[PDB]
Amino acid sequence: QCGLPKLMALELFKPFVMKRLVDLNHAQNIKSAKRMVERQRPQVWDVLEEVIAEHPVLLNRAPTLHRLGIQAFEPMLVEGKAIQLHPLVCEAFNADFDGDQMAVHLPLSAEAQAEARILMLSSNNILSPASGRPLAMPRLDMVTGLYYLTTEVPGDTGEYQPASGDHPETGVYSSPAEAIMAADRGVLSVRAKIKVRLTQLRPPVEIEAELFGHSGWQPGDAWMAETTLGRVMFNELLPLGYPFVNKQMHKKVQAAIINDLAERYPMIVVAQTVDKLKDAGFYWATRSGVTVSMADVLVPPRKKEILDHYEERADKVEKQFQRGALNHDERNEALVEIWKEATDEVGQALREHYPDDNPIITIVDSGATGNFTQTRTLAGMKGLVTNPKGEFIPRPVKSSFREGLTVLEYFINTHGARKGLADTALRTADSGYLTRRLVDVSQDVIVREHDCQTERGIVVELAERAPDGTLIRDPYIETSAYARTLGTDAVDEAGNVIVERGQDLGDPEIDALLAAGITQVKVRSVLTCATSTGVCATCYGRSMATGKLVDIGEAVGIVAAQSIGEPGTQLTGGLPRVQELFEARVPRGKAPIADVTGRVRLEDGERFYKITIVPDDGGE
Amino acid sequence: GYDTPLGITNPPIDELLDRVSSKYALVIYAAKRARQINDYYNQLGEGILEYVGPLVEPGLQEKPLSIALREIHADLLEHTE
Amino acid sequence: RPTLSEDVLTDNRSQFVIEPLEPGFGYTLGNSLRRTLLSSIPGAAVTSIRIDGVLHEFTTVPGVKEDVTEIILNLKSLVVSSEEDEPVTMYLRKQGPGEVTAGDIVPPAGVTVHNPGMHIATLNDKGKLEVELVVERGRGYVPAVQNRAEIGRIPVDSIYSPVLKVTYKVDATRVEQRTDFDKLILDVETKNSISPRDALASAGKTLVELFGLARELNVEAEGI
Amino acid sequence: ISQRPTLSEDVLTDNRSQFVIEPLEPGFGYTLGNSLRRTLLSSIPGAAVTSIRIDGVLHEFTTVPGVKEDVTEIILNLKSLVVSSEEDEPVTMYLRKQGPGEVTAGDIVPPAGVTVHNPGMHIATLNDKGKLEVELVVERGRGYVPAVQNRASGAEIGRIPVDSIYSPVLKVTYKVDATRVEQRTDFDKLILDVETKNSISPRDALASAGKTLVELFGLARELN
Amino acid sequence: SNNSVPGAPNRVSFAKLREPLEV
Amino acid sequence: NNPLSGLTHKRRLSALGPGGLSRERAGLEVRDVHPSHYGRMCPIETPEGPNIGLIGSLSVYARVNPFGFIETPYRKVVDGVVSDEIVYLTADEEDRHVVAQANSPIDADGRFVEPRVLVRRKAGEVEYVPSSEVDYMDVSPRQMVSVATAMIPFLEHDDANRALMGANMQRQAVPLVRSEAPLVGTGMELRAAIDAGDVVVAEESGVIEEVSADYITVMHDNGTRRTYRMRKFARSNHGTCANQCPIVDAGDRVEAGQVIADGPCTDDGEMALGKNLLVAIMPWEGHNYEDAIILSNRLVEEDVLTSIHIEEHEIDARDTKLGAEEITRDIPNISDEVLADLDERGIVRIGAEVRDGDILVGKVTPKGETELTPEERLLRAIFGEKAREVRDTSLKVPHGESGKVIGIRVFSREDEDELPAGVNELVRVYVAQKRKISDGDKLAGRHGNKGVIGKILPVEDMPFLADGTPVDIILNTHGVPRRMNIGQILETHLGWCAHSGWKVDAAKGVPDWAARLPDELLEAQPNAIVSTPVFDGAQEAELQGLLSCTLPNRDGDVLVDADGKAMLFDGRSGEPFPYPVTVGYMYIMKLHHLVDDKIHARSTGPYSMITQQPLGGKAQFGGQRFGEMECWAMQAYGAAYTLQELLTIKSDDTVGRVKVYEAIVKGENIPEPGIPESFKVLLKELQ
Amino acid sequence: RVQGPREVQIHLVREVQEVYRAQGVSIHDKHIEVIVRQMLRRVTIIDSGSTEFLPGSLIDRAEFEAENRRVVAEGGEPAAGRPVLMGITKASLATDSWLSAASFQETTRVLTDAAINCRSDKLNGLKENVIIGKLIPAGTGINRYR
DNA sequence: CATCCGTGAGTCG
Ligand SMILES: Cc1ccccc1NC(=O)[C@@H](Cc1ccccc1)NC(=O)c1ccccc1
Ligand SMILES: [Mg+2]
Ligand SMILES: [Zn+2]
């Protein structure tokens, strides 16, 4: 849903309202009905409420960098003149509320509303078509709110105590209902570790087996657990049927839970579950006690102690250049190294000095928002600033913002800061331009067939061999293998096939091949599969959004284009390198490659490098 | 197993997608049927031989789409590509 | 328009709907009506117990499957209505192979057990079990340390309250052109002792009495 | 594990008076005082100016010859005017003053059943050759009601609708002394604080607060 | 004080004394 | 928009224009901060958009020399001894000398404290240098900055990124019904407002002989009189409200150069772009999430953030070929109810209140004698009503607009009012609106901490301090360490200290932290005004100390601690929030990004003459643009029918848009989209 | 030329990835591949043969092996071909639709050439259809679902 | 492997 202003609605559904006005005889013809809508007679407000009944509208936010930049919503009338947006889809639109404006389009045709409610509804497109990662997930206050209650506090009140002496076991409740009555009286903390018997939550897979023998857990079957009351409230949301999770909800944790529900539980479940998470986060974000004081932002203890050490290490380098033993290009390149190392040590100084109580660190480490590089720039030091050329400046900004930068300090930081804002506006232009080039280049690429049939695919290096022993997961596993369908049966050492051909790789099916010991798989690719016009379905595989095999007719070219250009803003290689590739220019670095394999003959000269290669197989 | 679907989430799209080849196909599937229902109410005013009326009980002021989309969930319609 | 009262049902619990409230009165009525049902209703539960074959807590009772701990928890969940304020005492004895329940309990006069089919402990053969129960009357919830014969007396968490768990939400209803009016939805789960519909009528009568003190001064103006 | 009917004491000061209520349920005093604070700040009936009119003035944004303030500043001064009316129906006050000198609220002519409580309130500094003829309407109501609602009714072009702040309540808070000593001596003592506008008494405010709430919680007692 | 020059309200200033010249 | 907006406008330094450079001709070197800008051009004040770098402001102390270069005042150092003699240096002149930073410690006579000091050297280079080589030193610490920039308290605590916005945004503030000076300032507020020329300053000394809302008269010593006429309720270039109110009462003794009457955004002759609100740093039930702002209904009920805006509407009566347009109260097929607010002429009456769709100036024009419809001829025979030859060409109230009609200006050719060739009567009707702060209205601090109003809770829903005082604004904690603009946090602390007052402990002497603190500040009243000059002012030491000197309320209780935090009670549940909340007073400006302006929608409207597509602009009642990037979004979705419908019947299908309208009002089905008239033009343009 | 068509396709895809990987962004190789695929769909003409293919012209592998399938069956010399790597700008320009290429870049150049080669446009593309107002031949536009 | 001419260089308002 979305908050469509009353005034906004009446002008969008204007012919629709004049229709039902002359219907219920509020107006005698279509001409009068118009004069009623314009005069804003009180009747039309009751009529408009009926007109917008489950008639979806399109919310769009410029610049539209991917297809989730336009989404459909069930329109809700609301007093006031602003459009009300659901918190979760902010990640998609990249829309904050520092004054952003959105467009609203009213789909007229029966097919248009159909395409809206089905293809374009926000509750269906929870996942990122680029990566399959959840975009409509707890983002800021939400994660901080959830991360609060799922934290295990040691000496917190109401905590479980063993029996010893004359007093029995303290901290054992009969049901979640009891523990709730405890924190209300003021004995129990919702963040303190306790033991409770639970009746409406499936235990862990490892413990359901120990306590039931996998007899199939049932709503009513009791069991004991060692968690915090707040962790319990959390699992009531996932809800039943989902294995209890006894951890602290970092964002990456919550990212996994949703992604798991994406795979297994149906779409309408994930939409409903993710709504329960949002409300839950905000209520507890309120009572998280996350607040910024000048007190909470502290200067490191060894501030001047550490900086004096690198200032003495720098004066030594300065005097080593004064005698002319150091080149001018080497002096700066070393001075850069001195101060870079300096800023790291200031950071360490904070982390250990800063409690995990501290709301600035409580926000950072929770995956709620913010970098520690910000927290360091805030409390420790700004560090190195960037030259107009781009090279780092020999002189460092020693003051943090908390202390206040000197006059000369602020001037040079300002120089660097602005050049960033300028570049940021230049790369965004080079991002959209590249995006539009990709869009035209892959337009005639649609999923046209269900199967190309070619046994051709390409090798994917799933695992890396370990010298000590064992198997190590490849870093590229997610992006290179996870969503692919197989074009060759994957067999281990035995004659036993682990995964068939024509099978979508899933999370467990990788684990099967990872435990089997096989370290290379062949998979159907868009590169390989040869169809007349465009590509087939099978090779492309799992549409990153749907989580299922791509539908026949999907504009997977444009979708691919978007996926690459959308995050184009966030680069340093860099975006030029990205263009330099897709345009296939003769590279800057122009690193040479061997024309024929063989033995290497390094014969370096101080003036010039020369590389001779003796062909392994005869040859010149 | 889930919570009662409210408003435009109903019928649950998952059970709806079960009865069709893909997302896209369901759209034209539903829309063309809604185009029959609004036809039926307009033609019933002045002409016989209209497309079959709502196979299920129409809700008060229910949109033709919402009707079609419901009777798809009731399997009461036939599917041709 | 005067406000309505509604009810959607279940055997042990139910939801109540109050609408339409004057804008800002959803929450004004919210948290106060919950803290009443959970705290300001009197009932009967267990204050302390005594086990025969127990001189310390860590060792389980001779002949019983469950630990000392899990027995306490099953007992807290026992629903009892005492007729006299003063503390009574009920005994529960059983031996041999089988399962002990709440129907095995021997209750004093005017003292009733409301869930005689509640599992308590599984006794094996040559398994002896004698327990003395101490029933009091109170309100809400009372810790164990506040209830601490010293020949095996165990302090128990007292759940006097006949209301188990209550949640509430405050949506907005559209009265006239105004979309400001508050609609209060309330979830109430009660024990097997009293129906939720009755628990509200008692919780509500409780609060009517408080605000009487204020009203007594002048009964100036209001309109329904 | 104790029972005692609650009290409602009072410690006074002219404009504001603290109310003490004890003994209450543990962890209840907080959500009980707030229920009164939300009743007071929003739904205590009173009276204020709704519209006015000024000689030779057709709208809000202009100047009267000889006066130091503009009409906007005059209307803005009139917001702070504290009024109590007894007439359920609208009534009309008057103000006419000329020559040099300062005009106040003491120069207002209140009809029967209408009393000003702050005559020392500055309104306008009429300089020499300054004349000011004003006509104020005062109604009864509660909470806050915007000016803009008056003009659509059918009001003639002369009148100047003014925003109404009926609530005669100023500033409300509370504090709670909860005895948490490990015993059956655990209770909560509630100290409510009410400051009024010298339009009605702090007691009378709390009185109308009780009359409202009692009528609300009474539906929680009616049977289905 | 800060700008004891025109006839302004007194705005008390944390400062090192700034007497070079008025803006 | 405000007096500052105008002031900064005049001091703009723009590279653009004839004899200058194009925006496309500018490389990345022109636009970044050059070292020679120091004390001459502001490195903070510059646009955010594509115009960044090319437009700046002139630094405060900088002046222009007859050859058109930028000079700046430097104090002269003879031999380690600071002289009060001042010489202006051009940029290259300064390169040949050696200059000391302003805040370098100086003897009571004038000598330096340390031999080696911080020194600015040619080519942006800095190095410590013995005091025997010091030629000049900076006049003021706040010398590199502009007038706008200099008004951001604790500037040295904010990142240039948000300090830049905070600068640009002050000129975006809107004049409120009445103005409050900020509890926390920098000293610039005074000099700005005066030199802005939108207040009223006294020429010669004297005594107020007569005071009115209309004019102020002054009796000079030499006997002569000067009467100053107040600008009352005037429309600005941007429709803000330039309203001047006299400060001085009758018979006051006033001296020359004193502000006798301030104007828009000005209190006692000081720049007042906003109000001082009660701030709470905390997340609150998600309504402040992602820089959204939550407000107390007090600010609506008490007209705290309420402003006045004036629109000027226009219409004329020309000579046509069918006659001449005549303005009249007699408009074709209109009830006497719709004309009930007009005079005999056909003009709206002053004082009347107008809604959109209503009539302001009744104008009729003679229509072309074309053969009326054979279906409309017959319809005029039945009812026997003869058609008029005059089509209604009235001036109606545009969509969104509404208010009271506060003035009418009329120009007649008849009354020898020299009009342009062809015009007879010309009317201008001025309508003002008293805009209360609503959902979506853009608020901002001086620290670039912008954001729109998310929710306005009832006054009782608001989190409140112990004494029952409900806060005004609830800012989100999350959008604070990210932006690096913690100067907003320092403003909050100093703000509360300025609200409650303070008093350092003088017993056992003056405390060591308050040893640098000027005597005047060791004691402060409730609601006292202060100055934290840029690259000077309060330090984090004094601030922490001052937080403990916080004087108790009327009930004799201190409300906030030495951490600056204070305990809050949830106005909804009643229970106290678990942890202490940072509370204080922050200065909030109302920006000119109000929903009443920004909101817009269109079913059918006017169309493009050539392309037959909808026009663009809220003023033209145009539609949105569904562009090339937005097409790809539909295409990726695979929503072909939506997409098609958008660029066909919803845009430039001549016959389709009309026939889709009929299908909707008839309740039938949406037809099949025809051919896009734009494409038909392409083929003819190619032809 | 050294490692052959298939190896250069996996080169780009990982060099591309390595840049996004650096900045924390994870795109699935899939999408990159769709783009890279379009870059290699044309080969260059070394020898004209019996074909009417001008030598030194970049022609579709589908067209090249179907015109060499028609001339192999006719009895004439097939054109000798070498794979060639295209940048996305050039490839987009070399599209079958003069409509799509005019609306892309260098409009005046697109027209002057297509007006000489008497190029006909079979309106079967996304860009082509959006312009004329036909349902795009994708999604709920293909005849299968339509 | 480097010059000279012609064509690109974000969106809404
Ligand atoms: C080097 C430079 C490039 C662009 C803009 C300004 C500068 N230089 C500075 O900002 C100097 C101060 C200055 C200003 C004007 C002329 C000369 C010098 N500040 C510093 O070099 C500096 C470096 C680290 C900490 C503090 C100040
Ligand atoms: Mg934004
Ligand atoms: Zn294939």
Side-chain angles (χ1 to χ4, degrees), chain D residues 71-100:
Chain D
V71 181
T72 294
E73 182 164 13
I74 287 182
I75 299 179
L76 194 143
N77 284 319
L78 274 175
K79 312 267 190 178
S80 35
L81 176 62
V82 182
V83 186
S84 62
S85 183
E86 303 168 358
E87 311 273 354
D88 208 324
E89 38 180 358
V91 287
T92 301
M93 321 182 311
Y94 285 87
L95 180 134
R96 295 174 189 181
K97 199 174 187 300
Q98 213 194 26

Side-chain angles (χ1 to χ4, degrees), chain F residues 659-675:
Chain F
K659 283 205 170 185
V660 169
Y661 202 100
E662 177 195 296
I664 295 177
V665 304
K666 279 194 173 184
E668 307 176 7
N669 275 6
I670 292 307
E672 194 171 327
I675 266 76

Side-chain angles (χ1 to χ4, degrees), chain A residues 61 94-100, chain F residues 450:
Chain A
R61 190 261 178 180
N94 186 41
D96 36 33
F97 296 108
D98 46 35
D100 301 24
Chain F
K450 43 186 179 177

Side-chain angles (χ1 to χ4, degrees), chain A residues 55-78:
Chain A
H55 186 169
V57 304
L58 300 190
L59 289 201
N60 173 31
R61 190 261 178 180
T64 315
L65 299 192
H66 60 213
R67 77 179 185 181
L68 300 186
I70 310 178
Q71 292 191 11
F73 294 87
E74 185 183 355
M76 304 305 181
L77 277 190
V78 55

Side-chain angles (χ1 to χ4, degrees), chain F residues 26-90:
Chain F
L28 291 187
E29 322 95 334
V30 200
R31 319 165 87 115
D32 52 21
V33 182
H34 190 268
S36 76
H37 284 31
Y38 191 79
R40 296 172 179 85
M41 171 169 167
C42 206
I44 301 297
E45 191 142 31
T46 178
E48 254 200 293
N51 246 7
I52 183 178
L54 312 176
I55 297 184
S57 198
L58 170 91
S59 291
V60 177
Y61 293 108
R63 82 179 191 184
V64 204
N65 74 331
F67 270 81
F69 303 91
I70 316 200
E71 289 183 340
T72 179
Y74 287 118
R75 265 197 296 185
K76 184 180 174 185
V77 170
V78 184
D79 275 322
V81 188
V82 172
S83 175
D84 283 23
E85 171 181 336
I86 313 158
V87 50
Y88 285 101
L89 281 78
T90 79

